[PDB]
Amino acid sequence: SIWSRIVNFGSGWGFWVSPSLFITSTHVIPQSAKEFFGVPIKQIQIHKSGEFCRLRFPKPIRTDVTGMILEEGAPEGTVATLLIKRPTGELMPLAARMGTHATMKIQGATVGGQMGMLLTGTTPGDCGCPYIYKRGNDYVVIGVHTAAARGGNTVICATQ
Ligand SMILES: *[C@@H](CC(=O)OCC)[C@H](C[C@@H]1CCNC1=O)NC(=O)[C@@H](CC(=O)[C@@H](NC(=O)c1cc(C)on1)C(C)C)Cc1ccc(F)cc1
Protein backbone atom coordinates (compact mmCIF):
# COMPACT_ATOMS: atom_id res chain seq x y z
CA SER A 1 0.00 0.00 0.00
CA ILE A 2 2.29 2.73 1.30
CA TRP A 3 5.29 0.52 0.52
CA SER A 4 4.63 0.71 -3.22
CA ARG A 5 5.40 4.45 -2.97
CA ILE A 6 9.02 3.78 -1.91
CA VAL A 7 11.13 3.15 -5.00
CA ASN A 8 14.77 2.65 -5.95
CA PHE A 9 16.28 6.06 -6.71
CA GLY A 10 19.98 6.57 -7.36
CA SER A 11 22.10 5.36 -4.45
CA GLY A 12 19.06 5.29 -2.17
CA TRP A 13 15.29 5.71 -2.20
CA GLY A 14 12.48 8.18 -2.78
CA PHE A 15 8.81 8.47 -1.91
CA TRP A 16 5.71 9.38 -3.91
CA VAL A 17 3.79 11.87 -1.77
CA SER A 18 1.20 12.20 -4.55
CA PRO A 19 0.77 11.21 -8.22
CA SER A 20 3.01 14.15 -9.13
CA LEU A 21 5.30 14.79 -6.11
CA PHE A 22 8.39 12.67 -5.38
CA ILE A 23 10.72 13.40 -2.46
CA THR A 24 14.18 12.05 -1.71
CA SER A 25 17.55 12.97 -0.20
CA THR A 26 19.95 15.38 -1.88
CA HIS A 27 22.73 12.80 -1.38
CA VAL A 28 20.81 10.21 -3.41
CA ILE A 29 19.38 11.99 -6.49
CA PRO A 30 21.44 11.12 -9.61
CA GLN A 31 23.18 14.31 -10.74
CA SER A 32 23.75 13.12 -14.34
CA ALA A 33 20.38 11.61 -15.28
CA LYS A 34 18.67 12.90 -18.42
CA GLU A 35 15.20 11.79 -17.33
CA PHE A 36 13.36 10.45 -14.30
CA PHE A 37 10.53 7.96 -14.82
CA GLY A 38 10.53 8.67 -18.56
CA VAL A 39 10.06 12.43 -18.12
CA PRO A 40 12.88 14.65 -19.46
CA ILE A 41 14.67 16.35 -16.58
CA LYS A 42 14.06 19.86 -17.94
CA GLN A 43 10.31 19.38 -17.48
CA ILE A 44 10.78 18.39 -13.81
CA GLN A 45 10.58 21.20 -11.25
CA ILE A 46 13.07 20.41 -8.47
CA HIS A 47 13.45 22.21 -5.11
CA LYS A 48 16.24 21.67 -2.53
CA SER A 49 16.32 22.61 1.21
CA GLY A 50 19.63 21.15 2.43
CA GLU A 51 19.25 17.37 2.26
CA PHE A 52 15.51 17.52 1.43
CA CYS A 53 14.85 17.11 -2.30
CA ARG A 54 11.37 17.32 -3.85
CA LEU A 55 10.56 16.67 -7.51
CA ARG A 56 7.37 18.00 -9.13
CA PHE A 57 6.48 16.22 -12.37
CA PRO A 58 4.47 17.99 -15.08
CA LYS A 59 1.90 15.17 -15.32
CA PRO A 60 0.69 12.50 -12.88
CA ILE A 61 3.12 9.58 -12.78
CA ARG A 62 1.56 7.39 -10.06
CA THR A 63 -2.14 7.86 -10.76
CA ASP A 64 -2.92 4.94 -8.43
CA VAL A 65 -1.89 6.73 -5.21
CA THR A 66 -3.69 9.40 -3.21
CA GLY A 67 -2.12 12.65 -2.10
CA MET A 68 -0.56 12.45 1.35
CA ILE A 69 -0.03 15.22 3.89
CA LEU A 70 3.54 16.57 3.84
CA GLU A 71 4.60 18.62 6.89
CA GLU A 72 7.88 19.92 8.29
CA GLY A 73 8.74 17.28 10.85
CA ALA A 74 6.50 16.02 13.62
CA PRO A 75 5.52 17.29 17.07
CA GLU A 76 8.33 16.60 19.53
CA GLY A 77 7.99 13.17 21.11
CA THR A 78 5.94 11.72 18.24
CA VAL A 79 6.77 8.07 17.60
CA ALA A 80 7.07 7.98 13.82
CA THR A 81 8.00 5.14 11.46
CA LEU A 82 11.05 5.15 9.20
CA LEU A 83 9.93 3.01 6.24
CA ILE A 84 13.14 1.28 5.19
CA LYS A 85 13.13 -0.76 1.99
CA ARG A 86 16.21 -2.91 1.49
CA PRO A 87 17.60 -3.96 -1.92
CA THR A 88 16.53 -7.51 -1.04
CA GLY A 89 12.97 -6.17 -1.14
CA GLU A 90 12.46 -6.66 2.59
CA LEU A 91 10.19 -4.14 4.30
CA MET A 92 11.70 -2.86 7.56
CA PRO A 93 9.51 -0.37 9.45
CA LEU A 94 11.68 1.14 12.20
CA ALA A 95 10.02 2.96 15.08
CA ALA A 96 11.68 6.27 15.94
CA ARG A 97 10.83 8.80 18.63
CA MET A 98 11.18 12.19 16.95
CA GLY A 99 13.02 14.90 18.87
CA THR A 100 14.06 18.49 18.32
CA HIS A 101 13.83 20.40 15.06
CA ALA A 102 17.12 22.16 14.45
CA THR A 103 19.60 23.42 11.90
CA MET A 104 22.38 20.87 12.38
CA LYS A 105 25.98 20.44 11.32
CA ILE A 106 26.51 17.01 9.74
CA GLN A 107 30.04 16.26 8.50
CA GLY A 108 30.67 19.99 8.12
CA ALA A 109 27.51 20.71 6.14
CA THR A 110 24.38 22.49 7.35
CA VAL A 111 21.16 20.48 7.17
CA GLY A 112 17.67 21.34 8.36
CA GLY A 113 15.57 18.60 9.86
CA GLN A 114 14.53 16.74 12.98
CA MET A 115 16.43 14.37 15.25
CA GLY A 116 14.99 11.00 16.14
CA MET A 117 15.78 8.01 18.32
CA LEU A 118 15.43 4.44 17.08
CA LEU A 119 13.39 2.77 19.79
CA THR A 120 14.59 -0.82 20.12
CA GLY A 121 19.50 -0.05 12.45
CA THR A 122 20.08 2.11 9.37
CA THR A 123 22.74 1.77 6.67
CA PRO A 124 24.28 3.77 3.79
CA GLY A 125 21.72 2.48 1.31
CA ASP A 126 18.76 3.77 3.32
CA CYS A 127 18.96 7.49 2.57
CA GLY A 128 15.81 8.90 1.02
CA CYS A 129 13.40 6.59 2.81
CA PRO A 130 10.45 8.39 4.38
CA TYR A 131 9.47 9.10 7.96
CA ILE A 132 5.71 8.76 8.53
CA TYR A 133 3.26 8.87 11.43
CA LYS A 134 -0.52 8.58 11.78
CA ARG A 135 -2.53 11.55 13.07
CA GLY A 136 -6.19 10.76 13.64
CA ASN A 137 -7.07 8.79 10.53
CA ASP A 138 -4.54 10.54 8.27
CA TYR A 139 -1.02 9.40 7.42
CA VAL A 140 1.53 12.24 7.51
CA VAL A 141 4.97 12.17 5.87
CA ILE A 142 7.46 14.40 7.68
CA GLY A 143 10.78 14.03 5.86
CA VAL A 144 13.40 11.69 4.45
CA HIS A 145 16.28 9.78 5.98
CA THR A 146 19.67 11.45 5.62
CA ALA A 147 21.95 10.49 8.52
CA ALA A 148 22.50 8.37 11.62
CA ALA A 149 24.99 9.05 14.39
CA ARG A 150 27.76 6.63 15.26
CA GLY A 151 27.78 5.33 18.81
CA GLY A 152 24.05 5.78 19.24
CA ASN A 153 20.57 5.21 17.88
CA THR A 154 20.03 8.79 16.69
CA VAL A 155 18.78 9.31 13.13
CA ILE A 156 18.32 12.52 11.15
CA CYS A 157 15.16 13.28 9.18
CA ALA A 158 15.71 16.05 6.65
CA THR A 159 12.63 18.27 6.37
CA GLN A 160 11.29 20.98 4.08
C1 LIG B 1 22.69 7.69 3.40
C2 LIG B 1 23.36 8.53 2.33
C3 LIG B 1 24.68 7.98 1.88
O1 LIG B 1 24.96 6.81 1.88
O2 LIG B 1 25.49 8.97 1.47
C4 LIG B 1 26.78 8.68 0.89
C5 LIG B 1 27.01 9.62 -0.30
C6 LIG B 1 23.56 7.64 4.67
C7 LIG B 1 22.80 6.90 5.78
C8 LIG B 1 23.55 6.69 7.12
C9 LIG B 1 24.85 5.90 6.87
C10 LIG B 1 25.09 5.16 8.19
N1 LIG B 1 23.73 4.95 8.64
C11 LIG B 1 22.82 5.77 8.09
O3 LIG B 1 21.62 5.77 8.33
N2 LIG B 1 23.90 8.98 5.12
C12 LIG B 1 25.16 9.40 5.34
O4 LIG B 1 26.14 8.69 5.17
C13 LIG B 1 25.28 10.83 5.80
C14 LIG B 1 26.39 10.93 6.83
C15 LIG B 1 26.16 10.17 8.12
O5 LIG B 1 25.12 9.59 8.35
C16 LIG B 1 27.27 10.22 9.19
N3 LIG B 1 26.50 10.75 10.30
C17 LIG B 1 26.76 11.94 10.88
O6 LIG B 1 27.67 12.68 10.56
C18 LIG B 1 25.84 12.35 11.97
C19 LIG B 1 26.00 13.46 12.83
C20 LIG B 1 24.90 13.41 13.62
C21 LIG B 1 24.41 14.25 14.74
O7 LIG B 1 24.14 12.37 13.24
N4 LIG B 1 24.72 11.72 12.21
C22 LIG B 1 28.03 8.94 9.45
C23 LIG B 1 27.31 8.07 10.45
C24 LIG B 1 28.25 8.16 8.13
C25 LIG B 1 25.61 11.72 4.61
C26 LIG B 1 25.46 13.20 4.87
C27 LIG B 1 24.21 13.74 5.18
C28 LIG B 1 24.06 15.09 5.42
C29 LIG B 1 25.17 15.91 5.33
F1 LIG B 1 25.02 17.23 5.57
C30 LIG B 1 26.42 15.42 5.02
C31 LIG B 1 26.55 14.06 4.78
Author numbering: 4 to 123, 133 to 172
Give verbatim excerpts from the published study on this entry.
To understand the role of R112 in ligand interaction, we determined the crystal structures of the R112A mutant of GII-Pros complexed with rupintrivir as well as enzyme and inhibition kinetics. Surprisingly, there is little change in backbone conformation between the respective rupintrivir-bound WT and R112A proteases of all GII strains. The BII-CII loops in the R112A protease structures adopt an open conformation even without the R112A sidechain present, with the conformation of the rupintrivir pose remaining the same as in GII.4-Pro Sydney and GII.3-Pro WT structures. In GII.4-Pro HOV R112A, the rupintrivir-bound protease backbone shows the moderately open BII-CII loop position seen in rupintrivir-bound protease structures from other GI and GII strains, indicating that this is the most stable rupintrivir-bound conformation for HuNoV proteases. These highly similar backbones between WT and R112A mutant proteases, especially in the BII-CII loop, further confirm that the main cause for the lower potency of inhibitors against GII-Pro is the steric clash and subsequent unfavorable interaction of the P2, P3, and P4 residues with the BII-CII loop, rather than steric hindrance by the R112 sidechain alone. Interestingly, in contrast to elevated B-factors in the BII-CII loop between apo and rupintrivir-bound structures, the B-factors remain marginally the same between the rupintrivir-bound WT and R112A structures. However, our assays with R112A mutants of GII-Pro reveal that the R112A mutation does not significantly increase the potency of rupintrivir against GII-Pros. In GII-Pros, but not in GI.1-Pro, the change in enzyme turnover rate outweighs the change in Michaelis constant, resulting in a significant drop in protease catalytic efficiency. Similarly, we posit that the R112A mutation likely hinders ligand displacement by the protease, resulting in increased affinity to the protease for all ligands.
